[PDB]
Scaffold this active site. Structure first.
Site, short mmCIF file in Angstrom:
data_model
loop_
_atom_site.label_atom_id
_atom_site.label_comp_id
_atom_site.label_asym_id
_atom_site.label_seq_id
_atom_site.Cartn_x
_atom_site.Cartn_y
_atom_site.Cartn_z
N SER B 138 0.88 -1.15 0.10
CA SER B 138 -0.03 0.14 0.04
C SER B 138 0.82 1.05 0.20
O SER B 138 2.09 1.20 0.45
CB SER B 138 -0.94 0.00 1.28
OG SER B 138 -1.56 1.21 1.54
N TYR B 151 -2.42 -1.05 10.39
CA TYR B 151 -2.16 -1.11 9.01
C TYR B 151 -0.82 -0.68 8.29
O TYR B 151 -0.17 -1.14 7.67
CB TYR B 151 -3.57 -0.39 7.96
CG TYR B 151 -3.62 -0.48 6.63
CD1 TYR B 151 -2.97 0.21 5.79
CD2 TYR B 151 -4.33 -1.80 6.17
CE1 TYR B 151 -3.17 -0.12 4.32
CE2 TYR B 151 -4.68 -1.99 4.92
CZ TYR B 151 -3.98 -1.31 3.95
OH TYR B 151 -4.10 -1.36 2.56
#
Ligand SMILES: NC(=O)c1ccc[n+]([C@@H]2O[C@H](COP(=O)([O-])OP(=O)(O)OC[C@H]3O[C@@H](n4cnc5c(N)ncnc54)[C@H](O)[C@@H]3O)[C@@H](O)[C@H]2O)c1
Ligand SMILES: NC(=O)c1ccc[n+]([C@@H]2O[C@H](COP(=O)([O-])OP(=O)(O)OC[C@H]3O[C@@H](n4cnc5c(N)ncnc54)[C@H](O)[C@@H]3O)[C@@H](O)[C@H]2O)c1
Lengths: 255, 252, 243, 250
Positions: B138, B151
């Site tokens: 990501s 995350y």
């Protein structure tokens, strides 16, 4: 796949640039070649692909010579859909022996010419609502090496420039990115091999060592492979690739 | 192109992983699908490309169910040539109010699943002297945002782990790299959008403006095509890299 | 310059830990110490500075024991003003030969503990209008090496977590940053080891960083001039990340 | 702290360079000021501390004038122990409208000058077995913004250059590093604020890029440079340390 498009690749007379031009010609793009030396081989290699090419010898040190390059592209093919800013030179020396004009001439070619290229291709791309601008930077846009004051500065400069242009084009169908290769076996690297072999004496050993010191795959990157990356970036799958510096470098930046 | 290769994509019963598995199937790879939910839709999407597919529902925070998933690929196909570590789990809270159940699962699914999938895949890739491990990390493998403690840690860990495996396999025809997407059009993100009685584009603008300069989505198919690129010979010396596809997210 | 502030330093019975503890205690901070092996040498060294030294031997791979370390800080001191998340281990092996429990252990200590420390300290730092959380990550939170699957993943995670916390606290007087050292000469390095061989490959200065250097930088982040350094990850490394 | 030392700060007749000068003078460094305007409030701001200050008005986009700056340091001080490359110029325009003299000049001042100050300062630092070279780049050494082609290219170029020199000196007691500030409260910025509730104007200004909504100060920067200057900076080499209220964290 690129049938209908015109690519301009600066310094496509040898090396990386010629490899990328070849891959874009194979994909159907008409090709504006640039660089010093005999233009014939490059034009021959491009014409094999069934595509039109012209070459201009503009020295991109010279802003007026860059303008004449783009204007020949306007006149021969109507405009540039894909600009690969690739032309570049190298000079190795400690920062305090670094020749003042090699400093100047590396910033000129390796950095300013990239901005001049961009500023000239970008209005037509925005007008035509499609464009790709790919800058051939380097691992030296991300990290340094000893002896490479000018080139590292210039390459970092390109990586930063790429960000700005990628950002200012974001809301359009024009993208701008950089590819940061590790070692590729071209004249620009052979020079370094020759210089390293100069004292001592094995060019094959000097070659291995040059590569081994920085590049853990122990394998050079190929111009074709970089041409295929450019082609990638030119596809729809590259439409949201913006302002990025993608390294293809056999591990150089991973460590 | 990929005829004769087996691809295992985790999280591929829908969304991103499915989009990527589809591009690999179309290139001619056999697929091991994985995930929760009815596997029927995803298996049908793969089969019509004239490729063999199977599915395993392994919960990826359970090491055994991961080893089960790799045993399936082994026993259908002889092992995995292309591994795409793709995991969907996000939780949003300020760090001091971030639930511990959430931190642990996010670390388990987004980071530790990547190590397990890797250690399970790699002996086979080395023996066969060809492999691709592609980790779908990501932008949050490269920067932070507020409320995303777990995350961001997990995805940053993946980007670091990619570099180790990348270096460890550098003298081989096995490579390991990460793709770092910004906002991707998913079925869930689409839901968030058509949540509107009256203009979906402005919804999208409002969503993307802060982080994503283009105001436009990366698609699962753009991501599939980069996977595919990474699997070509032009991918051979792409090693330990973390390439962003993010609409400009990391450029600012 | 830190009189009447309390610093909790993880992994401070020895080495980088202890040397950071010393600098903070020298600057006037009361110190909560942590770690294995026997704290009297450590406690006498921090107390040589005439500041209250108090120790908890928590194994930080255990969430309940992290909470008991903090409970101590809370009870001796009314809580933590400076958090230094330092405790760390290492295992060297190729990824496919990496022991499953070493992976889980390095993730828990080197990453999860840093989050747990953080979530335990931060509420008290917001409430009292001032705080520093400084994570000792590593060069390996920015680049990888062979053999270090778990370690590299954990320290990259710390660098990312630091960003999140740096951003979340950016409108308060609490900041959160990482220091990323290269090689420091410590048992857990002399493990890896003559020394100008281990250094040569990775660290161009061919000289070790010292825990005292690291302790001084910590003090700097703790000062008024670190007030707008936030979510950063600053490397002290002999040139390791320059190349 | 720096008693016996000489610090040359470029762009130090105000703003960041002056803040940095004042912190080094407070620490005991002799100070060579450079920059435009009247040097007097600056020369007196350093005299407050009981060190020697001289000023030279050199235009660092002119190599001959860079060299006269270093010649003056040589004559009055025996050279530079601490070189701070700080002077910076800026112009905002989209790339394809970017004026060509503006590109040339930004690159000259914000990048090429750093090369020139470096190659001049470093022989003496080496000879004396001690030196620090600190380049004041920008967060725009590490990321881009719209309108800033030239400033971003230059400051990136600075960060890369800093890596090279920090590597070529790595086995010496010379270090070279970069400081990358976000928004600093500088006289130009202060006049931006004045023109726009002072505190609302500040926040409206910093909201996009700088999460803390609060400025880095010249003072903070001076104290970093002082730190880079201590013994604890000795193994910091080729680094780019950001001070930015969270700008690069997101
Ligand atoms: N070979 C590598 O390892 C490597 C690695 C990373 C990046 N790069 C970059 O690749 C680019 C191409 O390099 P290469 O290795 O193919 O080098 P090369 O020397 O083989 O070719 C350079 C090309 O640029 C042309 N050129 C030189 N000066 C020019 C000028 N003033 N104006 C116009 N054209 C000019 C030459 O005629 C030639 O076409 C350069 O930017 C280099 O910085 C190379
Ligand atoms: N040593 C280096 O070259 C170097 C380089 C970069 C980063 N670092 C970091 O600095 C930190 C300190 O390491 P160091 O060199 O002093 O190593 P060290 O082994 O000398 O000290 C580690 C300390 O942590 C404590 N500790 C170990 N396991 C623990 C656990 N399970 N729970 C609670 N405490 C525990 C130990 O008892 C010891 O006091 C680490 O996080 C390391 O990653 C070190």
């Amino acid at each position: 796949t690129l049938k209908g498009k015109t690519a301009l690749v600066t310094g496509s007379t040898s090396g990386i640039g010629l490899g990328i031009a070849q891959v874009l010609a194979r994909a159907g793009a008409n090709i504006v070649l640039n660089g010093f030396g005999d233009p014939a081989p490059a034009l021959a290699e491009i014409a094999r692909h069934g595509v039109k090419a012209v070459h201009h010898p503009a020295d991109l040190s010279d802003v007026a010579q860059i303008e004449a390059l783009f204007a020949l592209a306007e006149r021969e093919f109507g405009g540039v859909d894909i600009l690969v800013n690739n032309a570049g030179i190298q000079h190795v020396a400690p920062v305090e022996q670094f020749p003042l004009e090699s400093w100047d001439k590396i910033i000129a070619l390796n950095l300013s010419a990239v901005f001049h290229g961009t500023r000239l291709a970008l209005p037509g791309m925005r007008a035509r609502n499609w464009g790709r601008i790919i800058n051939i930077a380097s691992v030296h846009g991300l990290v340094g090496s000893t002896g490479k004051a000018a080139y590292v500065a210039a390459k970092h400069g390109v990586v930063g420039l790429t960000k700005v242009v990628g950002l200012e084009t974001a809301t359009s169908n024009v993208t701008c990115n950089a590819i940061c290769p590790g070692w590729v076996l071209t004249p620009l690297v052979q020079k370094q091999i020759d210089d390293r072999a100069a004292n001592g004496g094995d060019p094959l050993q000097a070659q291995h060592d040059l590569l081994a010191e920085k590049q853990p795959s122990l394998a050079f990157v190929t111009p074709e492979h970089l041409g295929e990356l450019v082609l990638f970036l030119c596809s729809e799958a590259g439409s949201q690739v913006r302002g990025a510096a993608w390294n293809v470098d056999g591990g150089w930046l991973a460590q």
